[PDB]
Structure 1
Amino acid sequence: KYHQYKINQPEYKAANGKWEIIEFPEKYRQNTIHAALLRTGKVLMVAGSGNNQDNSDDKQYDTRIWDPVKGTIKKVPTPSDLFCTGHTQLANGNLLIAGGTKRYEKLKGDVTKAGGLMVVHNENPDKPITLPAGTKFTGKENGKTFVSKDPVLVPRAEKVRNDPGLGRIYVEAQKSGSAYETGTEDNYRVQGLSGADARNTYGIAQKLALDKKDFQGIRDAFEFDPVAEKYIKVDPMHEARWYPTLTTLGDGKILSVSGLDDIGQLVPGKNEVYDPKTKAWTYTDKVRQFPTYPALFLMQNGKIFYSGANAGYGPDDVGRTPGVWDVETNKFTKVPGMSDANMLETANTVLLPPAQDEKYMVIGGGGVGESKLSSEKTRIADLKADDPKFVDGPSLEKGTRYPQASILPDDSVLVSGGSQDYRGRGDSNILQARLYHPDTNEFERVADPLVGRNYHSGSILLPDGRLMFFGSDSLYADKANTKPGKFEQRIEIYTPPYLYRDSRPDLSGGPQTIARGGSGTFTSRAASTVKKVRLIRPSASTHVTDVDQRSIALDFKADGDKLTVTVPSGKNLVQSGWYMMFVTDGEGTPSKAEWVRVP
């Protein structure tokens, strides 16, 4: 339009950057749900079956590697249905990817009525129990009632605790509409049982709502080798997990937390650790339950910070409170102050730059399950404070689920997209982007994104300083919510303001390996202009969750055209692995990254 003229003016791009749509040849398209920047500089894009029933039925599983410099894309053979998986970079630079989705069950019953899977428990070792069709289950907390359509046989408990018999049955609300939906797990009383039967028999269900498909986890785990460009099978997890968080501990092992299991129950706090040297998994000694994709970050004291951000599931009163988790002792200490604590599902979490400060920001979020509630708020916790607590930061304009959030090499945080309602319901994509500035605690609006991104989206900082945005899985295609949504297969590249100004500093000397506490030397003719150096861990982003990205400040010295940088000593700050190293000048303009390996 004229718009298009406005947003291409030198002054405009200099203050707001600019967006571009990339669309791939039809043959390379997929529903990208997970992405990660690899140490090769290319982006792993993982769809699995892509939340597509035909692909699940055909075992059609997709992965791409996309080269942002050349703009080329290739397919990668994908061994398991690796969407709704967990993932993080290993010390060797491989991406550990574990969990994912079992072949999906057909959705049954009336599309206008809340329902889903009820898992019936039988505590009686003496006898099985059959609940006939039309059995009513009522939530002990939520008070809502659902009815089975078919009989279910629930086998005897087995003695060992008795281990309860379990039987799965579809249940459905009596009347249509969202008034009769639930958003969290509850324990359901079975109406019309008396005595012993009532004592030994009960239901557990996750959300029983209108986006109805029932998903189960798988145990498979792989290392993605970015040099070979292949998935390498490693030992499977002990637990099947759909939506686990994988997060690096102090000793370099990977902790896997939560997820739904092979029958769709929340894994009840049975966490496990991958040792990259043995390529084997071990249960943790002690149990702690969280909802799915919990946002879990390694702190400099070796404990885990849980921000409260999560993708849902489980009860509303277990693992819903932000805090500090000592994995070895299992002590959990609440961090108070969170505003809109009822709107933490589908929020983003960022460890603010520089990571040395241990400040976490929680952005946006929505009510449990398919709630119409959404939060405009940011909330910041400083974990180095005497009494740590969340305090509100700058607000967004609109309540926003699913905001994308990426650390930039200038210490800004790009916060972009999202939607006002569940899965972009009511055509509620928010086509806005901001820079968050940590030092001022201010938001600055920048250019609007071109493509809406809600559920199943993400963003990835690239070595050249641009950012890639992917995904978006709207429930509906139309504002009226009458037709099924189509998965967004375009990506965008966002060029920030800092690339529309003066010449950027030059940098060469990579790739290099630099130990914690060690130093390395790089070349920059513009060394004298460098104000900061940042070692930035590449992102692995899914479901509004990225426990990989962090930006570590490096001390440096300039000596003519030579920059000597020093890596901090702590293994809890500087996780082993590969990092982008950016140098930024006093005008805030970053170099392109060189890659550095920390052993």
Structure 2
Amino acid sequence: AKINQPEYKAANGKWEIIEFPEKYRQNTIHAALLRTGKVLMVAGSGNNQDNSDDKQYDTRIWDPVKGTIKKVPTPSDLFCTGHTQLANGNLLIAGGTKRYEKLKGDVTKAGGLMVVHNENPDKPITLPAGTKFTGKENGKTFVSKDPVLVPRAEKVFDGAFVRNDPGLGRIYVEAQKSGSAYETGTEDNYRVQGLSGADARNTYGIAQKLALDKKDFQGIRDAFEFDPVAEKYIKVDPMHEARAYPTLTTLGDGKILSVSGLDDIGQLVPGKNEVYDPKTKAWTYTDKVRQFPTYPALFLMQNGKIFYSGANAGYGPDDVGRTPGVWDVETNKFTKVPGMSDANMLETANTVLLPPAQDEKYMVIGGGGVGESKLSSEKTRIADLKADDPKFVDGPSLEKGTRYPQASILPDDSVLVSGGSQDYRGRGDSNILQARLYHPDTNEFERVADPLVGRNYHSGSILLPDGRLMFFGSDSLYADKANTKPGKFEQRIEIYTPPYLYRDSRPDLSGGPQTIARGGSGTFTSRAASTVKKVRLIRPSASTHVTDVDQRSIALDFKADGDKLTVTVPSGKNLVQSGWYMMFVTDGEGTPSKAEWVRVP
């Protein structure tokens, strides 16, 4: 196909690779558009064992207008963090990792770390090599290769006796036979074969997935605010819980909820959630437990409750926190939302609050089966949360089952859905080089230009102020279709220019940056004011692991008079979260202006 011709671009847009000078390359795993118009690109150690060992941590700031890039000193391994924009435009970033060593054993046999629990405070227990552990739910058996000493449970005192904290002993376990049939994909509690009586009651294992991509993966408590003006990470109070892969999401009071993650020995945080108050720069536990898998897609609804779409990055059990629903964080009540197709393929799915955000329609896109499953979903599922009895209904389908699809809201109310892979971490060279625009008004997909670079695990996408989009990342497990050689992280970046920039001249817009309060108005200059049909306030993305709880596009009422455009911000802090937004105006041809920045107090 002649993809650079004017007619083709007018219908399909165009992709371009940017490669950075080698000095500035990194394995970008998170990115966020900052209110300065620059993009924060966070690698941390970049899922690179050498960098993890050396404590080599990387961040960049990229100026898309100037093309320039700089390094930012990175104080901790911010790979594996959660992050969201605060009301002042700083990016709260919390959690991370201190380890993800590849585990040694037979590469053809499922395995990983078993955390053995000893509830007996009176004695330790040693389990010899060749101890068999059987998943109480999964029915699968794994064998240790070395002995493990599990310490006595530690008595905890006020000095009155409270309880016993179980002794914990980690040990590598492996399937007896080769092959994927012996893998697990979710946490289970494991029976230790050969114990009886008290030892049986008191000794059991907990393990996350025991499969072929084997890692010892541990969280940290660190938290920072990234200040986009200073261009630096500012240390704030650490979280109470160590968390690799938490979601951070803004509540109706403007405080930030931190949910889930793996703890400091690789166990799922057991529903112990916490709230950051930006006014105190401190964290407080919520009162009651509510457990989810990692990177749960959690969005603030107009009634102040949190919508969990079901999309997540995995870990934890298959039967807690896996159903979509509406969570009242203050009461802790959770009400499941029915109707999700491919409810067994929600790991690595994307979630978008469709434009306009007023409508409270959420779309879940693609996904795959738990852990290293070969299952992948071609479906979209849409829930309308304004309904009295909300439910998911299928939307338009993709051509192929797709893990890891990128999904970015555009200023014309389309959603760009691109990339992903048909299988786990792109294995079998399964990157899908396809892009589509979802049109909420027709409920259909329109195929657009194919991306140039494949993007699976550890990818993402960011809408820029000029209306183009940046795509980053991709961490294939293997380099080849045969799955014999290790993959190399994708360091190339792409810019996608949508069809709307291959049309007539775009509307002009000036008068930013401005502060405009909810329920208030601001006036801008546009010579093309009388052509404007839509005004959108779009929250900048913070994207990682197929998860972006920041992006949303809010419709604004407006009036044009001559070259003056007056816009009014909607009421409701649950809708228009405080913070910085891109304001785009779009004409009757569907062509957007470049954005002006608007701060909502």
TM-score, normalised via structure 2 length: 0.98
In the alignment, which residue of structure 2 is the partner of 1:111?
Answer: 107
Q: Secondary structure at the match of 2:581?
A: strand
**In 2: Cα distance, 1:106 partner to 1:461 partner:** 34
> Deviation per CA, 1:143-164, whole angstroms, max 9, x where unpaired?
1111111111111123324321
Which moves more between the two structures, 317-326 or 150-159?
150-159
- Displacement of 1:229: 0.4
**In 1: Cα distance, 2:13 partner to 2:243 partner:** 40
Aligned residues: 594
> Deviation per CA, 1:116-162, whole angstroms, max 9, x where unpaired?
11011111121111111111100011111111111111111233243
> Deviation per CA, 1:548-585, whole angstroms, max 9, x where unpaired?
00000001111111011011110000000000000000
Q: Secondary structure at the match of 2:99?
A: coil
**In 2: Cα distance, 1:339 partner to 1:214 partner:** 33
1:152 to 148, 153, 173: 148
Q: Secondary structure at the match of 1:196?
A: helix
Q: Secondary structure at the match of 2:500?
A: helix
- Displacement of 1:81: 0.3
**In 1: Cα distance, 2:398 partner to 2:565 partner:** 39
- Displacement of 1:101: 0.8
**In 1: Cα distance, 2:200 partner to 2:485 partner:** 42
- Displacement of 1:432: 0.2
In the alignment, which residue of structure 1 is the partner of 2:45?
Answer: 49
**In 2: Cα distance, 1:105 partner to 1:449 partner:** 32
In the alignment, which residue of structure 2 is the partner of 1:491?
Answer: 493
Verify the 8 A CA contact 2:94 2:221 in the aligned structure 1.
yes
Verify the 8 A CA contact 2:114 2:205 in the aligned structure 1.
yes
**In 1: Cα distance, 2:4 partner to 2:497 partner:** 12
Which moves more between the two structures, 509-518 or 161-170?
161-170
Q: Secondary structure at the match of 1:15?
A: helix
In the alignment, which residue of structure 1 is the partner of 2:270?
Answer: 268
Q: Secondary structure at the match of 1:391?
A: strand
> Deviation per CA, 1:409-467, whole angstroms, max 9, x where unpaired?
00000000000000000000000000000111000000000000000000000000000
> Deviation per CA, 1:227-270, whole angstroms, max 9, x where unpaired?
00000000000000000000000000000000000010000000
Verify the 8 A CA contact 2:12 2:448 in the aligned structure 1.
yes
Which moves more between the two structures, 256-265 or 168-177?
168-177
Q: Secondary structure at the match of 2:17?
A: strand
**In 2: Cα distance, 1:340 partner to 1:218 partner:** 33
- Displacement of 1:104: 3.2
Verify the 8 A CA contact 2:96 2:219 in the aligned structure 1.
yes
Q: Secondary structure at the match of 1:198?
A: helix
1:291 to 293, 312, 317: 293
**In 2: Cα distance, 1:179 partner to 1:237 partner:** 39
Q: Secondary structure at the match of 1:368?
A: coil
- Displacement of 1:105: 3.3
Q: Secondary structure at the match of 2:78?
A: coil
> Deviation per CA, 1:506-544, whole angstroms, max 9, x where unpaired?
000000001111110000000000001000000000000
> Deviation per CA, 1:141-198, whole angstroms, max 9, x where unpaired?
1111111111111111233243211111111111111111100000100000011100
Verify the 8 A CA contact 2:109 2:174 in the aligned structure 1.
yes
**In 2: Cα distance, 1:540 partner to 1:416 partner:** 17
Within 5 Å, which residues of 2 pair with 1:120-519? 120-159=116-155, 160-519=162-521
> Deviation per CA, 1:12-59, whole angstroms, max 9, x where unpaired?
100000000000001000000000000000100000000000001111
> Deviation per CA, 1:86-122, whole angstroms, max 9, x where unpaired?
0000001000000011133352211111101101111
Q: Secondary structure at the match of 1:102?
A: strand
**In 2: Cα distance, 1:134 partner to 1:235 partner:** 44
Verify the 8 A CA contact 2:102 2:214 in the aligned structure 1.
no
> Deviation per CA, 1:360-395, whole angstroms, max 9, x where unpaired?
000000000000000000000000012100000000
Gaps in structure 2 of 5+ consecutive residues = 156-161
What is the RMSD computed on CA atoms of the aligned residues? 0.7
**In 1: Cα distance, 2:147 partner to 2:136 partner:** 22
**In 1: Cα distance, 2:278 partner to 2:583 partner:** 25
**In 1: Cα distance, 2:154 partner to 2:52 partner:** 34
**In 1: Cα distance, 2:47 partner to 2:565 partner:** 47
**In 2: Cα distance, 1:523 partner to 1:576 partner:** 24
**In 1: Cα distance, 2:510 partner to 2:252 partner:** 31
**In 2: Cα distance, 1:387 partner to 1:213 partner:** 42
**In 2: Cα distance, 1:477 partner to 1:162 partner:** 48
Q: Secondary structure at the match of 2:407?
A: strand
**In 2: Cα distance, 1:227 partner to 1:105 partner:** 35
Q: Secondary structure at the match of 2:536?
A: strand
- Displacement of 1:290: 0.1
> Deviation per CA, 1:324-347, whole angstroms, max 9, x where unpaired?
000000000000000000000000
**In 1: Cα distance, 2:173 partner to 2:599 partner:** 52
In the alignment, which residue of structure 2 is the partner of 1:21?
Answer: 17
**In 2: Cα distance, 1:62 partner to 1:127 partner:** 45
- Displacement of 1:9: 1.1
In the alignment, which residue of structure 1 is the partner of 2:599?
Answer: 597
**In 2: Cα distance, 1:580 partner to 1:22 partner:** 24
Gaps in structure 1 of 5+ consecutive residues = 1-5
**In 2: Cα distance, 1:328 partner to 1:158 partner:** 33
Q: Secondary structure at the match of 1:215?
A: strand
**In 2: Cα distance, 1:58 partner to 1:396 partner:** 42
**In 2: Cα distance, 1:408 partner to 1:129 partner:** 58
In the alignment, which residue of structure 2 is the partner of 1:71?
Answer: 67
Q: Secondary structure at the match of 2:164?
A: coil
Verify the 8 A CA contact 2:111 2:210 in the aligned structure 1.
yes
- Displacement of 1:222: 0.4
Q: Secondary structure at the match of 1:161?
A: strand
Q: Is 1:97 matched with 2:99?
A: no
Verify the 8 A CA contact 2:99 2:216 in the aligned structure 1.
no
Verify the 8 A CA contact 2:308 2:326 in the aligned structure 1.
yes
**In 1: Cα distance, 2:544 partner to 2:223 partner:** 17
**In 1: Cα distance, 2:54 partner to 2:187 partner:** 31
**In 2: Cα distance, 1:165 partner to 1:26 partner:** 47
> Deviation per CA, 1:186-214, whole angstroms, max 9, x where unpaired?
01000000111001110000000000011
In the alignment, which residue of structure 2 is the partner of 1:3?
Answer: none
**In 1: Cα distance, 2:273 partner to 2:100 partner:** 24
Q: Secondary structure at the match of 2:199?
A: helix
Q: Secondary structure at the match of 2:556?
A: strand
Q: Secondary structure at the match of 2:505?
A: coil
